[PDB]
Structure formats: structure tokens, C-alpha cells
Amino acid sequence: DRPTIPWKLIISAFSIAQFSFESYLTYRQYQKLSETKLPPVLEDEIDDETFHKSRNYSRAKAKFSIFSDIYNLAQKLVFIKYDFFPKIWHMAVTLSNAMVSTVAQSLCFLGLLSSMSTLVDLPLSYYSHFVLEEKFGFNKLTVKLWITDMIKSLTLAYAIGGPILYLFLKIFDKFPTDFLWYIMVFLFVVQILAMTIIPVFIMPLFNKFTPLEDGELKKSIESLADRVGFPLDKIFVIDGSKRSSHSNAYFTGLPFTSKRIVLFDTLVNSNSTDEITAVLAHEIGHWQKNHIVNMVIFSQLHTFLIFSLFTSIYRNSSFYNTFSGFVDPVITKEFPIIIGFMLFNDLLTPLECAMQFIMSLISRTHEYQADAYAKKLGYKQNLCRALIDLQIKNLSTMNVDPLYSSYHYSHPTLAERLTALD
């Protein structure tokens, strides 16, 4: 536990290492998608034509994935070896006029930084939407709406992100010796408010929430709810058609309290008729077995590990000194917590890989249990046809690499979800 260790080399080595590992995964997946032509348990229920089209969708996804990784590894390594952070700090504070200048310039640094991460990402985000998924008729948005969404995301990020971060940072000042349990509780309470505030206040700005047109489907879902429990405030059908013809469904409720069921516009349309309910049995499965409880708990362990280790490396950095020590246009005074946190974030990357395996696996077995639970309710045959139709219209990957799926896939392979039931 001490200051002088070669940080530059280690961080560059880690980023390259885990990029290479991720490149290996993506490589295997590309192999299988291009070579294999048959699913074992889906050889009858997958059109030979819509199978090839799905091979192509996944191909382009992988290609773009690798280019996106190289791009994000390239700008990082350049950011590192050329000490690009100090420079942004100076340029940020320089653009602060009105005095209303303060001790927490950290917010300024992050203000310009995140805005740069946006503009540098912009080209990729544009390609993915207006090329990768326009080529497969998935994207239904105009540039007008895309840009407006970007601006709304940044404006919100500052509006509520600034205040929360500020308090988060000043909590370190009040407790320089024992901050752990305080910032722990802080993140917990922000989490609770988060799941309650984003759906109620933030989402309405993105999509138009309308209540489910009273009739058949409303009654069906209402009946499944009353049967298995009392968790149901109301049902809304969001307009997710405006973005792309992708489908999904979820419920938003502050647990444990009333829960609202949101259904995607493309879902109620003619892809899922009332196999929709089998799906909702699956999604009620997550609630019944207290998975959300297991997830917040497994999340708190993670956070504790992270900020337990933080105590070790929030003292001295190779980068600017903060209280001429041997290099140029450096930054001075109080050590700034935000910076030590970021570099620490890129120090952990291997730990994250480990917990990427762990989290992906837990989610997978949660889906397993929810499906089995849908069988318990008799929605087995409809649930099967639901998942199959989703994979058909979303051109999801048919036969995947075990390792690649073990790392990335939070949901088990379709074939793997069926064999557990069918």
C-alpha cells in the first residue's frame, strides 16, 4: 500500500488485455455464425431464409462491435500515454465566467469530459442506428429525433447528475477517514429514488405513455395478476415504434408497492397476440421468487468491494500532483476524488471481467427459474411460441458460442430456454 508504482503501464496493459479477451470471444462468435447452418432443436421452427438474414444481422453486429472496441481502446490509450485529462481540466475551468467559481472544479472537468465522450461517440451511435439497423428495416427514427434525444440525455445528465455527484463528492470531505459506510448508504438511497424517479418523471419525456385500451388483453393480464397476486397498479402501452421495431415488456414499481406494467407498442401489434400473457407470466416470475431482492443484495456486495479497495488508492496518483514536482501545466491543491475514482475504475477491469461472468450467470439462472415458473402456471406452450416469434422478428442469434454467451448473454439461448421447458 504505497504511491510509487508504474500506473501508466499497468492500465494500458489491462485495457489491451481485456480488449483482446473480448476480441477472442467476438471472434469465436463470428466463426460460428458464419460457418454453421443448422440449429438442433430449432431446425423445424426457423425458416431457412429468416435464418440467413439473422446470420447477417449478427455478422454486422460483431463487425461493428470489434470496430467500436478498437475505437474505444484507441482513444483511451491515447488519453493515457499523452496525459489528456489535465489539459481538459484546465480548459474546463477556463470556460467558467459570470465570482461564481468554486472549490469543486471537478464538476466542470466532468462537464466538458462527458460532452466530449458524447461527440466522439456520435459517429458510432449514428452508424448503428441509421446504417446497421436501417439496413435491416429495424430503425424507424429521423435524425431530428435522434439528436433531440441526445440533447435531452445530456441536459438531464447535468440537471440531476450534477447535484447528485456534488453531494456524493462532498460526502468524502465530511468523512475523510471513514467514508465507506456513508457513501454506501448514499448510493443505496439514490438507487431507491432512481427506480422511482426515472420511470415517473424522466421516461415521460422520451415516450408517450397511454393506458392500455380497455378490452380483452386488459382483462387477461388483470386475471393473471389477481390469480397469482395483488401486484398491479395499471397497464400502459408505450410508443417504442418511434425508435425501432424492437419489442420488450417490463414493470416499474417501487418495491415493495404497487407495480405498473409497461408494454411496448411493437409488442401489442401483430407479433404477439395474447402469448403476451405467457411472457408476463415469465416477467412475474422474476417478482415471485424475489430476484430483485437477490439483485440489490448482490449489487451491494459489489459496491462494498469496490469502495473497500478505493480506500487504498485515493491517496496519490502518477498524474497531476495537487499540492514544480517535475512536469508541466499540472493541477494543484486538494486531491480531487472524482479522478482517483476513474483511474481506479480502469484499474479494476479484470475484477469486472470476473463479476461480468458472475452477474451474467445469475441473470441466466433467474430466467431459467422464471420460465419454469411460467410452466407451473401452464403458459408453457404460449411462452415457447412467444420467444420463438421474438427471435424471428428481432433476428436474434440462432446458435451462439458457449463462451461468448457465458460472458455477454444475460438471457439463456432460445434453444436453452426451450429445452428447459419443451
Ligand SMILES: [Zn+2]
Ligand atoms: Zn426474464
